[PDB]
Design a protein around this nucleic acid. Structure first.
Length: 183
DNA sequence: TAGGGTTAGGG
């Protein structure tokens, strides 16, 4: 049994009339559910428009995601890897992005080092190892863009990532302005 | 479209 957090999916954009039951009815098609819930207002009981489904295995979660687009109760919903309550406190943690910031890479890191590790997560579109403007010096970080936002979500939920022999920190890439609002 | 009475004691 892998961690509950890794076996869970956040489902956004849920129809007003989707219930624990209708949601389970749909997603149970890709595996056993150990949990399924529609979030609603504690007072009006009105749907908050999102919920969670948890499978018995991550392989089942992966099958569900490979089955996009997902339509529930006549509405196209948006399944996403569930971000922990702790990580959800981080700026941009819930953004739908295709690019990741990879920090703390050795000076001799080359693109193939990034490919070797990250391709396991999806189709890479662009790799950018940053250097100082005019100095040529390596800055110790890079950006990797994928073709599926889920590749990014699958990556950032994990804690460790080994590139060029050592651990590196990986976060969703935020624009200069986004971080400024979070700085 | 970000969580369900689910996050710092007492020695």
């Amino acid at each position: 049994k892998e961690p509950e957090q890794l076996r869970k999916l956040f489902i956004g954009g849920l129809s007003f009339e989707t219930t624990d039951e209708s949601l389970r009815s749909h997603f149970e098609q890709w595996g056993t559910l150990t949990d399924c819930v529609v979030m609603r207002d504690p007072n009006t009981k009105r749907s908050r428009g999102f919920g969670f489904v948890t499978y018995a295995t991550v392989e089942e979660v992966d099958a569900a995601m490979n089955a996009r687009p997902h339509k529930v109760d006549g509405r196209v919903v948006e399944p996403k890897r569930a971000v922990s309550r702790e990580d959800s406190q981080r700026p941009g943690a819930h953004l739908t992005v295709k690019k990741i910031f990879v920090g703390g890479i050795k000076e001799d890191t080359e693109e193939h080092h990034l490919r070797d590790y990250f391709e396991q997560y999806g189709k890479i579109e662009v790799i950018e190892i940053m250097t100082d403007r005019g100095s040529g010096k390596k800055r110790g970080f890079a950006f990797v863009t994928f073709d599926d936002h889920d590749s990014v979500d699958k990556i950032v939920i994990q804690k460790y990532h080994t590139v060029n022999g050592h651990n590196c920190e990986v976060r969703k890439a935020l624009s200069k302005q986004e971080m400024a609002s979070a700085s």
